Ligand SMILES: COc1cc(-c2cncc(-c3ccc(C4CCN(C)CC4)cc3)c2C)cc(OC)c1OC
Protein backbone atom coordinates (compact mmCIF):
# COMPACT_ATOMS: atom_id res chain seq x y z
CA UNK A 372 0.00 0.00 0.00
CA UNK A 373 0.95 3.72 -0.34
CA UNK A 374 2.10 5.41 2.92
CA UNK A 375 1.76 9.16 2.22
CA UNK A 376 4.18 10.61 4.84
CA UNK A 377 4.76 14.01 3.18
CA UNK A 378 3.50 16.93 5.37
CA UNK A 379 3.43 20.37 3.73
CA UNK A 380 4.76 22.89 6.29
CA UNK A 381 2.69 26.03 5.55
CA UNK A 382 3.45 28.63 8.26
CA UNK A 383 5.44 28.90 11.48
CA UNK A 384 3.04 29.56 14.41
CA UNK A 385 5.68 29.42 17.21
CA UNK A 386 9.50 29.66 17.56
CA UNK A 387 11.46 29.31 20.83
CA UNK A 388 14.42 27.60 22.52
CA UNK A 389 12.29 24.33 22.27
CA UNK A 390 12.37 24.64 18.45
CA UNK A 391 9.39 25.64 16.26
CA UNK A 392 5.70 24.75 15.67
CA UNK A 393 4.32 24.82 12.12
CA UNK A 394 0.82 24.64 10.76
CA UNK A 395 1.09 21.79 8.28
CA UNK A 396 -1.16 19.97 5.86
CA UNK A 397 -1.56 16.20 5.47
CA UNK A 398 -4.09 14.86 2.90
CA UNK A 399 -5.87 18.28 2.90
CA UNK A 400 -6.19 18.33 6.78
CA UNK A 401 -4.41 20.77 9.15
CA UNK A 402 -1.87 19.31 11.59
CA UNK A 403 0.54 20.97 14.01
CA UNK A 404 4.23 19.98 13.60
CA UNK A 405 6.63 20.64 16.47
CA UNK A 406 10.23 20.48 15.23
CA UNK A 407 12.59 20.01 18.22
CA UNK A 408 15.91 21.78 18.72
CA UNK A 409 18.94 19.55 19.52
CA UNK A 410 18.69 21.42 22.90
CA UNK A 411 15.32 19.81 23.72
CA UNK A 412 15.55 16.24 22.30
CA UNK A 413 14.70 14.76 25.72
CA UNK A 414 11.23 16.46 25.58
CA UNK A 415 10.51 14.57 22.30
CA UNK A 416 11.76 11.30 23.84
CA UNK A 417 9.64 11.74 27.02
CA UNK A 418 6.41 12.59 25.17
CA UNK A 419 7.05 9.74 22.68
CA UNK A 420 7.79 7.29 25.54
CA UNK A 421 4.56 8.31 27.32
CA UNK A 422 2.41 7.90 24.18
CA UNK A 423 4.13 4.55 23.48
CA UNK A 424 3.02 3.51 27.03
CA UNK A 425 -0.55 4.95 26.92
CA UNK A 426 -2.34 6.40 23.90
CA UNK A 427 -4.08 9.27 25.70
CA UNK A 428 -7.36 10.25 24.05
CA UNK A 429 -9.34 13.03 25.74
CA UNK A 430 -11.16 16.12 24.48
CA UNK A 431 -9.05 18.34 26.80
CA UNK A 432 -5.63 16.78 25.91
CA UNK A 433 -3.97 17.94 22.65
CA UNK A 434 -4.59 15.11 20.20
CA UNK A 435 -1.52 13.00 19.35
CA UNK A 436 -1.05 12.03 15.68
CA UNK A 437 2.60 10.99 15.30
CA UNK A 438 6.21 11.02 16.55
CA UNK A 439 8.77 11.05 13.73
CA UNK A 440 12.55 10.58 13.84
CA UNK A 441 14.33 11.11 10.47
CA UNK A 442 18.08 10.50 9.86
CA UNK A 443 19.82 13.57 8.28
CA UNK A 444 23.44 13.77 6.90
CA UNK A 445 24.94 15.00 10.23
CA UNK A 446 21.87 15.13 12.60
CA UNK A 447 18.59 13.49 13.71
CA UNK A 448 15.34 15.47 13.01
CA UNK A 449 12.56 14.98 15.64
CA UNK A 450 8.97 15.98 14.90
CA UNK A 451 5.82 15.67 17.03
CA UNK A 452 2.60 15.87 15.03
CA UNK A 453 -0.68 16.74 16.70
CA UNK A 454 -4.11 18.16 16.02
CA UNK A 455 -4.04 21.83 14.98
CA UNK A 456 -6.01 24.44 16.99
CA UNK A 457 -6.25 27.51 14.77
CA UNK A 458 -7.28 29.81 17.70
CA UNK A 459 -3.81 29.21 19.28
CA UNK A 460 -2.83 29.19 22.93
CA UNK A 461 -4.90 30.45 25.85
CA UNK A 462 -2.03 32.90 26.51
CA UNK A 463 -2.51 34.25 22.90
CA UNK A 464 -6.32 34.30 23.21
CA UNK A 465 -6.48 36.18 26.54
CA UNK A 466 -4.30 39.06 25.19
CA UNK A 467 -7.17 40.69 23.18
CA UNK A 468 -10.29 38.62 24.13
CA UNK A 469 -12.55 39.21 27.14
CA UNK A 470 -14.80 36.54 28.59
CA UNK A 471 -18.30 36.29 30.06
CA UNK A 472 -19.33 33.94 32.89
CA UNK A 473 -20.24 31.05 30.57
CA UNK A 474 -17.03 31.25 28.46
CA UNK A 475 -14.80 31.73 31.53
CA UNK A 476 -16.26 28.68 33.30
CA UNK A 477 -16.15 26.59 30.09
CA UNK A 478 -12.42 27.36 29.68
CA UNK A 479 -11.45 26.60 33.29
CA UNK A 480 -13.65 23.52 33.68
CA UNK A 481 -12.20 22.12 30.39
CA UNK A 482 -8.65 22.66 31.75
CA UNK A 483 -9.59 20.98 35.10
CA UNK A 484 -11.13 18.10 33.10
CA UNK A 485 -7.94 17.56 31.07
CA UNK A 486 -5.80 17.84 34.23
CA UNK A 487 -7.95 15.39 36.23
CA UNK A 488 -7.72 12.95 33.29
CA UNK A 489 -3.90 13.17 33.37
CA UNK A 490 -3.73 12.80 37.18
CA UNK A 491 -6.11 9.79 37.57
CA UNK A 492 -4.88 6.20 37.34
CA UNK A 493 -7.41 3.98 35.49
CA UNK A 494 -7.06 0.17 35.99
CA UNK A 495 -7.52 -2.44 33.17
CA UNK A 496 -6.67 2.14 31.51
CA UNK A 497 -3.72 4.54 32.11
CA UNK A 498 -1.04 5.36 34.64
CA UNK A 499 -1.40 8.56 36.67
CA UNK A 500 0.44 11.43 34.91
CA UNK A 501 1.65 14.79 36.21
CA UNK A 502 2.31 17.48 33.58
CA UNK A 503 5.03 19.54 35.39
CA UNK A 504 4.84 22.58 33.01
CA UNK A 505 1.21 23.75 33.12
CA UNK A 506 0.80 27.37 32.01
CA UNK A 507 -1.38 29.40 29.63
CA UNK A 508 1.10 28.92 26.72
CA UNK A 509 0.67 25.10 27.09
CA UNK A 510 -3.15 25.28 26.77
CA UNK A 511 -4.80 25.58 23.33
CA UNK A 512 -8.27 27.08 22.66
CA UNK A 513 -10.70 25.05 20.56
CA UNK A 514 -13.46 26.47 18.37
CA UNK A 515 -16.12 24.93 20.70
CA UNK A 516 -14.89 27.11 23.59
CA UNK A 517 -13.19 24.28 25.50
CA UNK A 518 -9.39 24.09 25.85
CA UNK A 519 -6.84 21.28 25.65
CA UNK A 520 -3.60 20.78 27.56
CA UNK A 521 -0.40 20.49 25.48
CA UNK A 522 3.29 19.56 25.96
CA UNK A 523 3.99 16.38 27.89
CA UNK A 524 7.78 16.73 27.43
CA UNK A 525 8.25 17.01 31.25
CA UNK A 526 5.43 14.62 32.20
CA UNK A 527 5.94 11.89 34.81
CA UNK A 528 3.99 8.64 35.03
CA UNK A 529 3.03 6.57 38.13
CA UNK A 530 14.46 20.93 31.29
CA UNK A 531 12.61 22.16 34.42
CA UNK A 532 9.20 23.82 34.76
CA UNK A 533 8.65 27.46 33.74
CA UNK A 534 10.01 29.39 36.76
CA UNK A 535 7.12 31.91 36.96
CA UNK A 536 4.69 29.00 37.54
CA UNK A 537 6.88 26.98 39.99
CA UNK A 538 5.27 25.97 43.28
CA UNK A 539 6.90 27.01 46.55
CA UNK A 540 8.22 23.46 47.25
CA UNK A 541 10.01 23.45 43.85
CA UNK A 542 11.58 26.87 44.53
CA UNK A 543 12.72 25.95 48.09
CA UNK A 544 13.75 22.39 47.02
CA UNK A 545 11.55 20.77 49.73
CA UNK A 546 9.42 18.87 47.17
CA UNK A 547 9.12 15.16 48.22
CA UNK A 548 10.63 13.90 44.88
CA UNK A 549 9.91 10.20 45.80
CA UNK A 550 6.09 10.89 46.12
CA UNK A 551 4.04 11.00 42.91
CA UNK A 552 1.31 13.07 44.68
CA UNK A 553 3.97 15.82 45.04
CA UNK A 554 3.95 16.35 41.27
CA UNK A 555 0.13 16.50 41.16
CA UNK A 556 0.25 19.24 43.82
CA UNK A 557 2.79 21.20 41.72
CA UNK A 558 0.36 21.04 38.80
CA UNK A 559 -2.53 22.29 41.01
CA UNK A 560 -0.45 25.34 42.03
CA UNK A 561 0.13 26.12 38.35
CA UNK A 562 -3.57 25.52 37.60
CA UNK A 563 -4.46 28.14 40.21
CA UNK A 564 -2.20 30.71 38.47
CA UNK A 565 -3.86 29.88 35.10
CA UNK A 566 -7.29 30.27 36.74
CA UNK A 567 -6.16 33.77 37.93
CA UNK A 568 -4.95 34.67 34.42
CA UNK A 569 -8.35 33.69 32.89
CA UNK A 570 -10.54 35.19 35.65
CA UNK A 571 -8.89 38.61 35.17
CA UNK A 572 -10.28 38.64 31.60
CA UNK A 573 -13.90 37.86 32.67
CA UNK A 574 -16.04 41.06 32.48
CA UNK A 575 -18.24 41.97 35.48
CA UNK A 576 -20.21 45.20 35.98
CA UNK A 577 -18.42 46.64 32.88
CA UNK A 578 -14.94 46.04 34.39
CA UNK A 579 -12.11 43.76 33.25
CA UNK A 580 -8.38 43.53 34.08
CA UNK A 581 -5.77 43.70 31.31
CA UNK A 582 -3.97 40.43 30.52
CA UNK A 583 -0.97 40.02 32.84
CA UNK A 584 1.12 36.95 33.63
CA UNK A 585 1.19 35.69 37.22
CA UNK A 586 3.48 37.85 39.48
CA UNK A 587 3.86 40.54 36.77
CA UNK A 588 3.97 43.20 39.50
CA UNK A 589 6.65 41.58 41.75
CA UNK A 590 9.24 39.88 39.43
CA UNK A 591 11.05 40.91 36.26
CA UNK A 592 10.46 39.49 32.80
CA UNK A 593 12.27 36.11 32.66
CA UNK A 594 12.45 36.06 36.43
CA UNK A 595 15.38 34.17 37.99
CA UNK A 596 14.85 31.14 40.20
CA UNK A 597 15.94 33.37 43.14
CA UNK A 598 13.50 36.17 42.16
CA UNK A 599 10.67 33.62 42.31
CA UNK A 600 11.83 31.96 45.55
CA UNK A 601 11.93 35.32 47.38
CA UNK A 602 8.38 36.21 46.24
CA UNK A 603 6.69 32.82 46.62
CA UNK A 604 8.65 31.20 49.52
CA UNK A 605 10.20 33.96 51.62
CA UNK A 606 7.52 36.70 51.38
CA UNK A 607 4.74 34.14 50.60
CA UNK A 608 3.10 36.53 48.11
CA UNK A 609 0.15 35.40 46.00
CA UNK A 610 -1.53 37.01 43.00
CA UNK A 611 -3.83 39.98 43.82
CA UNK A 612 -7.64 39.44 43.86
CA UNK A 613 -9.22 42.74 42.70
CA UNK A 614 -12.08 44.17 44.75
CA UNK A 615 -14.39 44.12 41.69
CA UNK A 616 -14.37 40.29 41.78
CA UNK A 617 -16.30 40.40 45.12
CA UNK A 618 -19.33 42.04 43.34
CA UNK A 619 -19.59 39.00 41.00
CA UNK A 620 -20.68 35.56 42.34
CA UNK A 621 -18.62 33.64 39.68
CA UNK A 622 -15.39 35.57 40.34
CA UNK A 623 -16.02 35.37 44.12
CA UNK A 624 -16.23 31.52 43.81
CA UNK A 625 -13.17 31.44 41.46
CA UNK A 626 -11.14 33.58 43.95
CA UNK A 627 -11.88 31.01 46.70
CA UNK A 628 -10.91 28.18 44.34
CA UNK A 629 -7.59 29.74 43.30
CA UNK A 630 -6.76 30.39 47.06
CA UNK A 631 -7.20 26.64 47.67
CA UNK A 632 -4.69 25.84 44.87
CA UNK A 633 -2.03 28.15 46.45
CA UNK A 634 -1.60 26.83 50.01
CA UNK A 635 2.08 26.75 51.05
CA UNK A 636 1.40 23.20 52.37
CA UNK A 637 1.08 21.12 49.16
CA UNK A 638 -1.16 18.50 50.84
CA UNK A 639 -3.76 21.27 51.70
CA UNK A 640 -4.32 22.06 48.00
CA UNK A 641 -7.52 20.87 46.27
CA UNK A 642 -7.32 17.89 43.89
CA UNK A 643 -8.22 18.28 40.19
CA UNK A 644 -11.34 16.13 40.81
CA UNK A 645 -12.43 18.43 43.69
CA UNK A 646 -11.80 21.50 41.43
CA UNK A 647 -14.10 19.99 38.74
CA UNK A 648 -16.83 19.36 41.30
CA UNK A 649 -16.55 22.94 42.64
CA UNK A 650 -16.63 24.37 39.08
CA UNK A 651 -19.79 22.33 38.16
CA UNK A 652 -21.63 23.94 41.16
CA UNK A 653 -20.71 27.56 40.10
CA UNK A 654 -23.74 29.22 38.34
C1 LIG B 1 5.41 5.80 8.98
O1 LIG B 1 5.26 7.21 9.05
C2 LIG B 1 4.03 7.78 8.72
C3 LIG B 1 2.94 7.02 8.30
C4 LIG B 1 1.74 7.71 8.00
C5 LIG B 1 0.64 6.88 7.47
C6 LIG B 1 0.22 7.23 6.17
N1 LIG B 1 -0.75 6.52 5.54
C7 LIG B 1 -1.24 5.44 6.19
C8 LIG B 1 -0.82 5.03 7.45
C9 LIG B 1 -1.36 3.82 8.06
C10 LIG B 1 -1.93 3.76 9.28
C11 LIG B 1 -2.34 2.51 9.79
C12 LIG B 1 -2.20 1.32 9.09
C13 LIG B 1 -2.70 0.04 9.71
C14 LIG B 1 -3.82 -0.58 8.94
C15 LIG B 1 -4.36 -1.77 9.74
N2 LIG B 1 -3.34 -2.83 9.79
C16 LIG B 1 -3.88 -4.07 10.41
C17 LIG B 1 -2.17 -2.29 10.52
C18 LIG B 1 -1.63 -1.03 9.81
C19 LIG B 1 -1.66 1.39 7.84
C20 LIG B 1 -1.24 2.63 7.35
C21 LIG B 1 0.15 5.78 8.11
C22 LIG B 1 0.59 5.38 9.47
C23 LIG B 1 1.61 9.10 8.06
C24 LIG B 1 2.71 9.84 8.47
O2 LIG B 1 2.54 11.22 8.56
C25 LIG B 1 1.34 11.68 9.25
C26 LIG B 1 3.91 9.17 8.81
O3 LIG B 1 4.99 9.93 9.24
C27 LIG B 1 4.89 10.47 10.61
Ligand SMILES: COc1cc(-c2cncc(-c3ccc(C4CCN(C)CC4)cc3)c2C)cc(OC)c1OC
Nearest residue numbers: 374375397398400401402435436437438452453454
Ligand atom coordinates in the same frame (compact mmCIF):
# COMPACT_ATOMS: atom_id res chain seq x y z
C1 LIG C 1 -2.01 8.63 12.34
O1 LIG C 1 -3.07 9.52 11.97
C2 LIG C 1 -3.94 9.14 10.97
C3 LIG C 1 -4.05 7.89 10.47
C4 LIG C 1 -4.99 7.57 9.46
C5 LIG C 1 -5.05 6.22 8.94
C6 LIG C 1 -4.62 5.97 7.63
N1 LIG C 1 -4.69 4.73 7.13
C7 LIG C 1 -5.11 3.71 7.84
C8 LIG C 1 -5.57 3.84 9.14
C9 LIG C 1 -6.06 2.64 9.83
C10 LIG C 1 -6.92 1.72 9.17
C11 LIG C 1 -7.32 0.62 9.85
C12 LIG C 1 -6.90 0.29 11.17
C13 LIG C 1 -7.40 -0.97 11.76
C14 LIG C 1 -6.59 -1.50 12.92
C15 LIG C 1 -7.06 -2.89 13.35
N2 LIG C 1 -8.40 -3.31 12.84
C16 LIG C 1 -8.27 -4.09 11.57
C17 LIG C 1 -9.39 -2.20 12.74
C18 LIG C 1 -8.82 -0.85 12.27
C19 LIG C 1 -6.01 1.17 11.81
C20 LIG C 1 -5.60 2.31 11.13
C21 LIG C 1 -5.54 5.15 9.68
C22 LIG C 1 -6.05 5.42 11.06
C23 LIG C 1 -5.90 8.54 9.09
C24 LIG C 1 -5.83 9.80 9.67
O2 LIG C 1 -6.65 10.85 9.38
C25 LIG C 1 -7.70 10.62 8.43
C26 LIG C 1 -4.90 10.09 10.65
O3 LIG C 1 -4.86 11.32 11.21
C27 LIG C 1 -4.10 12.41 10.69
Ligand SMILES: COc1cc(-c2cncc(-c3ccc(C4CCN(C)CC4)cc3)c2C)cc(OC)c1OC
Nearest residue numbers: 384392403404405451453455456459460509521522
Ligand atom coordinates in the same frame (compact mmCIF):
# COMPACT_ATOMS: atom_id res chain seq x y z
C1 LIG D 1 1.95 24.44 23.24
O1 LIG D 1 2.54 23.32 22.58
C2 LIG D 1 2.18 22.94 21.32
C3 LIG D 1 1.21 23.61 20.58
C4 LIG D 1 0.87 23.18 19.31
C5 LIG D 1 -0.17 23.95 18.55
C6 LIG D 1 -1.30 23.25 18.14
N1 LIG D 1 -2.28 23.87 17.48
C7 LIG D 1 -2.17 25.17 17.18
C8 LIG D 1 -1.07 25.94 17.56
C9 LIG D 1 -1.10 27.41 17.15
C10 LIG D 1 -1.64 27.77 15.91
C11 LIG D 1 -1.72 29.12 15.52
C12 LIG D 1 -1.25 30.14 16.34
C13 LIG D 1 -1.32 31.59 15.96
C14 LIG D 1 -1.02 31.94 14.50
C15 LIG D 1 -2.10 32.79 13.80
N2 LIG D 1 -2.69 33.87 14.63
C16 LIG D 1 -1.95 35.14 14.43
C17 LIG D 1 -2.78 33.57 16.07
C18 LIG D 1 -2.72 32.08 16.30
C19 LIG D 1 -0.70 29.80 17.58
C20 LIG D 1 -0.66 28.44 17.98
C21 LIG D 1 -0.02 25.30 18.22
C22 LIG D 1 1.23 26.07 18.63
C23 LIG D 1 1.46 22.05 18.80
C24 LIG D 1 2.42 21.34 19.56
O2 LIG D 1 3.07 20.23 19.09
C25 LIG D 1 2.92 19.82 17.73
C26 LIG D 1 2.79 21.81 20.81
O3 LIG D 1 3.76 21.15 21.55
C27 LIG D 1 3.45 20.00 22.31
